[PDB]
Design a protein around this ligand. Structure first.
Ligand SMILES: Cc1ncc(COP(=O)(O)O)c(CN)c1O
Lengths: 424, 431
C-alpha cells in the first residue's frame, strides 16, 4: 500500500483512495496527519536556530522549555529530563545509566534488568534484548547478558484451567518474586514494562497486576521503568498509562505522541533517587560520557512543545478518554461474533483477537492467517489496522470523533461478516 | 532569577557529555540563533562556529531552503512508516564504491548498532556462528548505544558503563605523534599497526572476526589522521582473512576531507558505509548506512520530513559546489594552521581538507602539557571562545571543522584568533 498524503485521521494512497488510519501510523500520530501548527513551529525554529547541541554545558531555549514542561507534567515527582531521537535509543541509554548508577552506588553486581515476554522496547542490540518477541531475537544472538524475561500478563493466553483473573495476577507476581530470588535480589537493578503492551498484541494486564508487581519490586528496592512510548500523552484515558494503572516509576520513557511523530524526538524522565548518584559519578569522571548529536534537537523540541500545547488547549486527553469509552463499548459488542476470541483494551487502544474455535482458542493454520485475511478485507473497506498474528489493533488519533469511531467499528463488523462467509 | 533560561536548564535538564555537578554550579551557555558560520548566545555575543556545531552543520546555521523543504513535507505527509525512496537512490548513486542498498536510522549510533546486528544476522545466515567479533580502534568514536559505545575506543565512553560488551575488540590508534616509537618513521609505524592487527586476528582465530570498523580520520578522538600507507596495509590484512570493512563516514562524509567521502581521500574500499551529520547538516536528525552486494546477497522506514531535508541539503551541496569550496578553503586552512607549528605551545598540527587538530604542549621534547593532560586544552579553548571562536577541546587538542560555506577571509579570522590565543596563553604561563 503506497501512502502519499494524510488529512486528520485519514491517509490517501497514490490512487486517491482514503483510509482511516486506525493505528495513527505507528501508534504515534496523536494530533492527526494535518496539524498546521506543527509545521509552523518547525519552520519558525528552523529559521532561527536550526541546530545546536546540548553537550558540554550548552543549551537552547526549546530544550529548556521542553525539559521543564515534561518534568512539570510527570505523573509522579521527577527531577530531570534527558533527550534522545528514538524510543529505542532512550531505553538503551536507560539501561546504560542504570548500570552507571549501580556503579555509582557501590553495587557492581546490581545490573540485571527484568523485562517481559511479549514486551516491546526497541531495536538496538540492548533494547531488542529487552524486547520479548521471538523474531526480534532470532538470528541476532540476542538477548545480551543481564537481560531476563518474566511472563506475559495476558490472561486469555496464559491463564491456567480454572484460574481467575486476580489469581493469575498473584501468580505472575509470585513468578517474578521467584525469579528475583533465584537470581539473587541484590543482582536485580530494574524492572521494565509498558502499562499496556502495544506491539505485543495490546495486552492489558489483569486487574491487581501492577499493585502486586510493585509490592514485589518495592520489597527489594528494584527500580521501575515505565515504558510509555505508546501509552504516553492520552492514549489510555489519562495523560500517562502510569496514571491509568497506578504505577510509580523511577524512570519514565516517552516518544511518539511527544511530537505526534512529526519529527524524531524522545525523552525519559528520572527521579531524584536516579539522578543524584549519576550526577556525583559524572563529577568524579569529569563528564557524563554519553549523548546523541541530535539530543534535544531544537526544531524537534519546538514541535514537541507545540504538540503538547495543542493536546492541552483542545482537551485531547479528555477527547481520547470519551471516544475511548465509546470505542471500547462498540468493540465489545462484537464479542458474540463467531470469529471474535477476545476483545481487550483501555482508553483509545484496543485489540481484537480472532479465532475459528472459541473453546480451543485456535484460528486458521498457521496462526496469523486469520488476522492477515481479515486485515486485507478491512483495508479494502477503508480502515488501516495492524495485524499482530490474529489480533487486529486499533489505536486511532486523539482527534477522532464518535462518528468516525462508529465508521471504523462498523467496517470491522462488516469485515468479520465477510471473512465468516468465506469460511462457510 | 529562578525563571531565567540558565536556571530552568539547571533545574530540569540532564545534559549529555557534561559534569552534572558543575552544570548545577555554572549553568549552561544558551545559544539563541544562527547566521551562516556564526551563532549568537542569549546575551547577544557572536561566535564563529568553528566546529559546525558537532562536526555537522555543513550549510551553516541560516539556510531557509531547508526550512521550506521540511515544512512542505510536513504539510503533505508528516509521518508514515517519495523522499525516503529518492534519498536512498541518491545515496547509492553517490557512493564512492559500488553499493546496493541504503538503510535509515535517526542517529549515527543507531546506524552503527544496526550494522553490528546485521553482521551477526548475516554470519548466522551463512552458517558461521563464530564469525561475530568486530575490531575497532583505540580513540575511535562510533556513538553511544551499548553496542556502539563498545565500538567507541575512548575511556569516557566506557568508565562506569561496564563497556565494552563481549565481541568488540580494540586495536591500536594510528596516531604517529603519540604512538610512534623512538626512531620509527611514519611508514614503519603503518607497517607495525598492520602487523599488530594481523597478530590480533591470528590470536583471536581469523574465522571469528566478522568486520573491522574505522573512521577515515578519527574525529572525536582528536582529529587523528593515519600515517601514510596505513589504509593500504590494513586493507591487505583484512582481505587476507575475508574480513568486512566498515567505513564510518559520519564526520568525513559530504565534503569534509577534500573529496565527497573520506574513503576516496584515503583510498578505502569499504563494504559498509555509515553516514550522518552533514547528510542533513543536522537540520533534522537522520542517518544512513549503505551495504554492497557482498554484504547484501546472503541476507537478500526513514522519517519522510528528515529525508526531505536531507535531500534538499544534498542538492544545496551539489548546486553550490560546496565539496570544491571546502577543498579550497581546506587547503588554505591547513596551510594557515601549519604556520603555527613553530609556536612554543604547539606540539602538532594535523588535518586534511576542512578538518584539523592543533595539539598543545608546554614541553615539546617530552610532549607534555600542564597537570593534568586536558588543562592546557581547556584553558586555550576558553580564551578562543572569549575571542569569538568556538572550538572543541579533546584533551589538549583543539579541533577545527568549520562549515562547508566558509570563505578564506573567515578562515583567516579563525586562525588569527587561534594564534592570538596561543600567545595569550603562553604569556599567562610565564607570569
Ligand atoms: C565517526 C562518528 N560515528 C558515529 C557517531 C554517532 O552519531 P550520533 O551522535 O548521531 O549517534 C559520531 C557522532 N560524533 C561520529 O563522529
Amino acid at each position: 500500500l503506497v501512502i502519499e498524503r494524510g488529512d486528520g485521521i485519514y491517509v490517501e494512497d497514490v490512487s486517491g483512495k482514503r483510509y482511516i488510519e486506525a493505528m495513527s501510523g505507528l501508534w504515534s500520530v496523536g494530533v492527526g496527519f494535518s496539524e498546521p501548527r506543527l509545521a509552523e513551529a518547525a519552520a519558525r525554529q528552523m529559521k532561527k536556530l536550526p541546530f545546536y547541541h546540548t553537550f558540554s554545558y550548552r543549551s537552547h531555549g526549546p530544550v529548556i522549555d521542553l525539559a521543564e514542561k515534561l518534568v512539570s507534567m510527570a505523573p509522579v515527582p521527577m527531577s530531570k529530563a534527558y533527550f534522545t531521537n528514538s524510543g529505542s535509543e532512550a531505553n538503551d541509554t536507560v539501561v546504560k545509566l542504570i548500570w552507571y548508577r549501580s556503579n555509582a552506588l557501590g553495587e557492581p553486581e546490581r545490573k540485571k534488568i527484568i523485562s517481559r515476554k511479549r514486551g516491546y522496547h526497541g531495536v538496538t542490540i540492548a533494547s531488542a534484548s529487552l524486547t520479548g518477541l521471538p523474531n526480534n531475537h532470532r538470528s541476532f544472538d540476542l538477548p545480551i547478558d543481564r537481560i531476563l524475561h518474566t511472563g506475559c500478563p495476558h490472561f486469555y493466553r496464559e491463564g491456567q484451567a480454572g484460574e481467575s483473573e486476580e489469581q493469575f495476577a498473584t501468580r505472575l507476581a509470585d513468578e517474578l518474586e521467584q525469579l528475583i530470588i533465584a537470581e539473587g535480589p541484590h543482582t536485580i537493578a530494574a524492572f521494565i514494562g509498558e502499562p499496556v503492551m502495544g506491539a505485543g498484541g495490546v495486552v492489558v494486564p489483569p486487574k491487581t497486576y501492577w499493585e502486586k508487581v510493585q509490592a514485589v519490586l518495592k520489597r527489594y528496592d528494584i527500580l521501575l521503568i515505565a515504558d510509555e512510548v505508546i501509552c504516553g500523552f492520552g492514549r489510555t484515558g489519562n495523560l500517562f498509562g502510569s496514571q491509568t494503572f497506578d504505577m510509580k516509576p523511577d524512570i519514565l520513557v516517552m516518544s511518539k505522541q511527544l511530537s505526534s511523530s512529526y519529527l524524531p524526538i524522545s525523552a525519559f524522565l528520572i527521579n531524584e533517587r536516579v539522578y543524584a548518584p549519576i550526577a556525583e559519578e559524572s563529577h568524579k569522571i569529569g563528564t557524563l560520557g554519553t549523548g546523541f548529536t541530535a539530543s534535544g534537537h531544537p526544531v524537534a523540541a519546538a514541535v514537541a512543545l507545540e504538540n503538547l500545547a495543542i493536546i492541552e488547549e483542545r482537551d485531547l486527553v479528555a477527547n481520547a478518554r470519551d471516544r475511548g469509552t465509546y470505542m471500547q463499548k462498540r468493540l465489545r459488542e462484537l464479542q458474540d461474533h463467531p470469529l471474535v476470541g477476545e476483545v481487550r483494551g483501555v482508553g483509545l487502544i484496543a485489540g481484537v483477537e480472532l479465532v475459528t474455535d472459541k473453546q480451543a482458542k485456535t484460528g486458521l493454520e498457521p496462526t496469523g492467517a486469520l488476522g492477515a485475511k481479515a486485515n486485507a478485507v478491512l483495508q479494502e473497506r477503508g480502515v488501516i489496522s495492524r495485524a499482530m498474528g490474529d489480533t487486529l489493533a486499533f489505536c486511532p488519533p486523539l482527534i477522532i470523533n464518535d462518528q468516525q469511531v462508529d465508521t471504523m467499528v462498523s467496517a470491522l463488523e462488516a469485515t468479520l461478516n465477510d471473512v465468516q462467509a468465506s469460511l462457510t
